[PDB]
Amino acid sequence: DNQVAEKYAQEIETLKEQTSTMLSAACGTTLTEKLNLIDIIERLGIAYHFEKQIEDMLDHIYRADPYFEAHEYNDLNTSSVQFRLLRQHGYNVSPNIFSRFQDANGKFKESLRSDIRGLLNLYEASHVRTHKEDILEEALVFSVGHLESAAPHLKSPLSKQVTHALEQSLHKSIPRVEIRYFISIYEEEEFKNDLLLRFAKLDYNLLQMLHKHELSEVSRWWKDLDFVTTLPYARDRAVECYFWTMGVYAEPQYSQARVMLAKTIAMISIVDDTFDAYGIVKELEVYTDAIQRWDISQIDRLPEYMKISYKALLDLYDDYEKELSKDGRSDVVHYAKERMKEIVRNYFIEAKWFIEGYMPSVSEYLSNALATSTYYLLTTTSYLGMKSATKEHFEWLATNPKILEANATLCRVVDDIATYEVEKGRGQIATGIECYMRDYGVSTEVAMEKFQEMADIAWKDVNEEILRPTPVSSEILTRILNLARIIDVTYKEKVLKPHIIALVVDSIDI
Template sequence: MAPALVENAVNCNKEIVRLLANFSPSLWGDHFMKYASDTQLKQEYSKDIEVLKNEVGSMLKPSGSNIVDALNLIDILERLGVSYHLENEIEKKLEQLFNLNTNYEDETYDLYTVALHFRVFRQHGYRISSDIFSKFRDGDGKFQEGLKSDPRGWLSLYEAAHLRIHGEEILEDALTFATSNLKSMAQNLSSPLRKQVEHALVQPLHFNIPRLEARNFISIYEEFESKNETLLRFAKLDFNLLQILHKEELLEVSRWYTELDCANKFPYARDRLVECYFWAMGLYHEPQYSRARIILTKTFVFVSITDDTYDSYGTIEELDVLTEAIDRWDISQIDKLPDYAKLFYKDLLELYAQFEQELAKEGRSYAVYYAIEALKELAKGYNVEAKWFKEGYLPPFDEYLKNGLITSTFYYDTMTSLLGIESVTEEEFKLLSQKPKIVVANLKNCRLIDDIATYEIEKERGQIATGIECYMKDNGVTKEEAMNKFDEMVTNTWKDMNEECLMPFSNSREVLMRIIGLSRTTNVTYKNYEDGYTMPEKVLEPHIIALYMDSIKIPQML
C-alpha cells in the first residue's frame, strides 16, 4: 500500500475521518480501448501456424527416437510457448520415454542432459528420483571439481533444483553450488549462454510465468547456432497471434470497466485493470482459456476494490455492515450500506448473477456458489484485519497467519480461476473447499511474499499488524531475521507444491496448474520484494509492454 492521506467525509451530520492511500493513476489510460484487430493478419498467421504445427508434430512421432533428442525438443517447444498445440502428443511421448528405464549411470548422460531429463519429467508430474545426480558427486559428497568448467550443465542443474521436494538434500546442495558457480562465471560467458544464465539467476524458469518465459526465450533461441528455423518461425507467429487475442480481450474488459465506471465510482481504489488481466494471463495464456481469463480479470478487479475498501476507506461500523451484507448475499441488504458501498454491492451481485446465468447454460452454476462462499470468507478476513489496524492490535503470529492465509485472496482466486473452465467438476470444487495441502501451501507462499514486499510501505502508513511485525514480536528477532525466516518458509511452500504436483495427483492437473500459476505470478509481481501490483512501474510495466504492446518481427518467407 502507498502512504495514506486523510479525507474528512460527512455522513449523517457526523464527521468521518478516512485514510486514503495515495495510489498512482493507471499507466495505460485508454490505450487498450483504441485497439483495432486485423482480421486478415489473424487469418494469415493461423494458416501458416497450422502448416508449421503439422511439421513440428511430425518431429515428435518417431517411436524409436533418441531420448536425449526427444526431451530436448519437448523442452524447447515448452520454453518457446508452443507446446499447447501438441499437448497430447507430448504427454504420450513422455510416458513412452519415462518407461524406457534409462540408465543414467551411462557416461553418455552428462550433467546438462541428466538435469534436463529430471526437470522435464518432474514438470509433468513424473516421480523421477534425485538419486540420478549422485554420479556427479565425489567421495566427500560434494559436486565434482571437474564440473566447474561446464556452465551449460550448471544452468541445467540450477533450473532442475527448483523442482525439489522435502528431503532431497542432494538438490539443496545442487542449488547452492549451481547458483554460486553461475554467478562467478556469468561475466565470462559468451552469448546466448550468458543471457540465459543472467536471466535464470534473476527469474528461475519454474517460478516464471510461461508467457514471459516464451517472450524471452524466443529472442535467446534465435541466437542458438543449433536453432531450428521451423520451430523459431512457429513460435514467433504463434506469439503474435496470441498477442492479438490477448489485446482483443483487453479491449473487451476495458470496455466493461469503462461502462461500469469503476474509476469514478471508487476513486479511493487502485485503478489496475491491465495488471488484473496480466495476473489472469499468468494462470493461463492459451486460446481455449479466453473466457476464463475475462471472468478472472473481472473478479480480480472487484477483489482489488474490496481490499482497498476494507484496508483504509471504510469505517469499522461501515465494514461490519458491508461484511454482513456480503455474507447474506441479498440485494435487500443494500439499504443498510453507505452510498459508496451501495454502488459496490449492487455491481458485485450483478456480476455474479451474470456468471451464474452464463454457467447455468452448461450445467455448471454450482461453480459460482463456491466462488461466492470464498468471497464471503475473504470479506470476513478483511474485516478482522481492518479492526486490527484501526484498533492498533498486534496479534500473535499464528493468529495473524491463520487470518492472513484467507486475506492473501488466493483461496478465492483459485475458485474464481476455475469458473470459466468447463472441464472442472463439482467434485473438484468440493475437494478444493476442504483446502488440501497444495492450496494451503499456495496461500502461505503468496501471503509471505506479499508481507515482505509490502512491509515498509504498510509500516509507513501506520499499519501495525503486519506479518513481519508479528513474527518479530513473537520471536524476539530483527527485521532481517524475520525476512530471512519468511524466505525459508516460502521455499518450503514450493517444496510442498512440487510434491503435490507429482503423480498420483490429488487434484486434476488442470486445477494444479492454476494453483501453480498463482504462485508464479506472485513471484513475478513481487520480484525483489517490490509491490509490483500497486506500483506497476517498478516491476510489471516492461512485462505488459512486451506481452501486449510489442509484437515480434517476423521476416517474410523467400
C-alpha cells in the same frame, strides 16, 4: 486485425502438423535429442498444441530406464533436462539420478565446472526440488557458484541465459514471460530450427491478438460499471487485473476463464477501495454482514457509496451463473462466491484489530491473512471458465488442500517481506514481520529469515504436491503453480510494466 490473424492461423495449422510429425519421428533418435526437442518446443511456447503427444513421450522416458543407467545419463545436461521435464510433468523421479556426478561426500565433481550448459540445466533442475532432497540442495549451491564465476567470459546468447536464469529460474517464472524471452534467445542461436522459431513467433503474435481482444472486453466491462464517477478515489486499474490472468493460462481455450478471473480481480480492487474509503467500523460492519447474507434486499442497509460495489458484486456473480448456464456449470459459481464472502470477513477482522490497535500472534495473523492475500479467491475463480473443472475439483479446493495453503502462504509471506522493508511501522502496524518479532521475541533479521524460510517451504510443498499420484489432474494443479509463479516474480509494482508491454503491447517482428 481479422485477416492478419487468419493468415497466422493458416500457416500455424501446417506448422503444427509438421511439428507433430517431428515429435513422432524423434522415436528413433537418441534420448538427448528427444529431450532437447521437447525442451525447445516447450520453451518456445508451442507445446500446448501437442500436449498428450509430449506427455506420452515423457511418460515413456520415465518408465523406460528408471535407474538412469546406460550411457547417455553420464552426461550432466541430459540428466538435468530429463529430471526437470519429468518432475514438472508430475513424474516423481529420484534425484538419485545425479549420484554419479557426485563423489564420496555428496559434493558435485569439480571436473563438471567446465560444462556451462550442463551446469545451467543442473541449476534449473534444482529449483524443482521438494523437501529432504539434499542432492538438489547441493546442486543449487554448486551450480550457482560456478555459473556466477564463468559468466564474465561467456558469449551470447548463453551469457544472457545464465544471467537470466540466476535472477529467476525457469520453473518459478511466469510461463508466458519466459516464452517471449526464450524466443529472443533462440533467434540469436546459430544452430536453431528455423521452422520451430517461425512457428513460435506466429503463435505468440496470434495469441497476443486474442489477449488484446480479451483486455478490451475486460476494459469495456469496467468502464460500463462507471465506478470512478461514483467513487472517484477508486483505482482505475483494469489492465493490471487482466494482466495476472495471462500468467495463470495463456492458451486460447482458457479465454473465457481469463475474462472471468479478470473481473473478479477488478471487483476485489473495488472492495478494497470501499473498505479503505472512510474506515468507519459501523459501516464496514453492515457492509460485511450484507455481503455474508448476499441479497439485493440488503442494499438499503448500506451507506450510499457502498451500494455501488454491492450491486456490482451481486450482478457479477449472477452473470457468472448465467454465462455458465449454457454448459450446466452454473452450480460451481457459489464456491467462488464463498471465497469472496470469506475475504470480506477477514478484511473486517483486520480492520478491527487495526482500530483496537491489536497485534495478533503469528498463528492468529496467518489464520486471517492467508485469505486477505486473495489467493483462495483467485485460485478458486481461475476454474470458473474452465469446462474441465468440475464440482469434485471445487469440493477439493474447499478442503483447503496442501497445495492451496502453500500457494496462499507463499503469496502472503512474500508480500509481507516486501512491504515491511518499505512501510515498516504505521500501516496497519500488525504486519506479518512485526507480528513475528513480538510473538517469538526475535529481531527483524531473524523474523525476515523465518518468513523467507516459509516461502522456501511453500515452494517445496508445491513441487511435491504436483508429483503423481495427484488428487486432481495436472491441468487443475497448473493454475495453482502458476499463481505461485506470478507472485514470486512480482515480489522478487511497475515490476510488471515491462511484462505488460511484452505481452499485450509489442508484437514480435516476423
